[PDB]
Design a protein around this ligand. Structure first.
Ligand SMILES: [Zn+2]
Length: 188
């Protein structure tokens, strides 16, 4: 929940587009509160999670990372008189059904500005495009992770033991390509 191991981060967040065995989704989150025109980090409200695989003693049919994330928000007991920026850094973007659920949540929770930075776009069998547009329309800010966000997530969410962020090959190129794709998706 607090700290991810380096192999897990590197395997999952590498932004080359191919699935290459990345069947899980990892989601890192942090929360900031608005104070005098500035965002203030809430240190106790940062963490990471992944999707839950089907389990007899968990969720019988599993639970996507995005739903696990929405599940935690009410437990933060955010002050409804304040304004928050909730930022997610995700290894894959949401499936269509999750995008719809996240859109519903944010529409009901206007004290929260949701910002999503994604390493890759999950096609969801052609369903992803409408989902992302729906999420944007509801007020989410959707962006592609670039070097600075990967480095941030490494520095903040990984048990690096002092090892610096080492970019994988093609990081900038994959990010640029994906940024083009997202522009095309969001402009319909
Ligand atoms: Zn989903």
């Amino acid at each position: 929940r607090h700290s991810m191991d380096p192999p897990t981060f590197t395997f999952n967040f590498n932004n080359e587009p191919w699935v290459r065995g990345r069947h899980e989704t990892y989601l890192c989150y942090e929360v900031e509160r608005m104070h005098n025109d500035t965002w203030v980090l809430l240190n106790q409200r940062r963490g990471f999670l992944c999707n839950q695989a089907p389990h007899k003693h968990g969720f019988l049919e599993g639970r996507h990372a995005e739903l696990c994330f929405l599940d935690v928000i009410p437990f933060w007991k955010l002050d409804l008189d304040q304004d928050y920026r909730v930022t997610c850094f995700t290894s894959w973007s949401p499936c269509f059904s999750c995008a719809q659920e996240m859109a519903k949540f944010i529409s009901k929770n206007k004290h929260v500005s949701l910002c999503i930075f994604t390493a890759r776009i999950y096609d969801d069998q052609g369903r992803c495009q409408e989902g992302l547009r729906t999420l944007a329309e509801a007020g989410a800010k959707i962006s592609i992770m670039t070097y600075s966000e990967f480095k941030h997530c490494w520095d903040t969410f990984v048990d690096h033991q002092g090892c610096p962020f080492q970019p994988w090959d093609g990081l900038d190129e994959h990010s640029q390509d994906l940024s083009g794709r997202l522009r095309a998706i969001l402009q319909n």
